[PDB]
């Protein structure tokens, strides 16, 4: 009868090569964004400039990763429900490619938007608190890699911020780009929200597995 612990969370964990590449790309973005006059003009929402690398002080300590289901060893809602799925068991330990379409910043978080393939969507949970469907967006829209958080912000916030951004962008509030950074168009969504839409999507290798701490 004896029950088994679940992981702390399921997700795609980037290889060291991929993790370092994306981490470097994220840091260059914060450096460039912070230098951009359009960003400096609207510093209200955050002769001195703001170093965003310092602002987003809390970074993922290990390799970067895209979380599917936070489980807390079973103490999270729907953890056992998610973990016993056939597709989760089959995909365990398996290698995937994650497509990064954009990098974004809010006063709370910094992260990368992941656009899941159809296969990868099968690994996306259905019972997320405040899902994409709740905001008129397709499931898996809030898939992401967290690059950094403000001091009193928890990592789960990054998914909420991406969702909020995509609801702005969906409803035609994207507008025209305020400018351009090296690797894409820079969009200002107001209220401290910024998005860099990559000219060429970035691909990273990651293994779908369970994290225990
Ligand atoms: Cl979702």
Numbering used by the authors: 160 to 205, 212 to 378
What does the publication say?
2′,3′-cyclic nucleotide 3′-phosphodiesterase (CNPase) comprises 4% of total myelin protein in the central nervous system (CNS), being the most abundant CNS non-compact myelin protein4. CNPase consists of an N-terminal polynucleotide kinase-like domain10, a catalytic phosphodiesterase domain11, and a membrane-anchored C-terminal tail, which contains a cysteine residue that undergoes isoprenylation. The catalytic domain enables the rapid hydrolysis of nucleoside 2′,3′-cyclic phosphates to nucleoside 2′-phosphates. The CNPase catalytic site, lying in a groove between two lobes, has pseudo two-fold symmetry and contains two apposing His-X-Thr-X (X denotes a hydrophobic residue) motifs, characteristic for 2H phosphoesterases 113537.
Tyr168 interacts with the substrate ribose moiety through C-H…π hydrogen bonding. While the Y168A mutation decreases catalytic activity, Y168S retains it, albeit with an elevated KM compared to the wild-type enzyme. An increased KM, whilst retaining similar kcat, is an indication of decreased substrate binding affinity, with a minimal effect on actual catalysis. In the absence of the aromatic ring, the serine OH group appears to be enough to retain catalytic activity; this could be related to differences in water networks or overall dynamics in Y168A and Y168S. To further investigate the binding mode, we also attempted co-crystallization of CNPcat Y168S in the presence of 2′,3′-cAMP, but even residual ligand density in the active site could not be observed. In the mutants, the missing ion-dipole interaction between the Tyr168 hydroxyl group and the His230 imidazole ring apparently causes His230 and Ala/Ser168 to reposition in the active site by ~1 Å. Additionally, loop α3-β2 moves towards the active site by the same distance. These structural features suggest that Tyr168 also has a role in fine-tuning the active site conformation with its bulkiness.
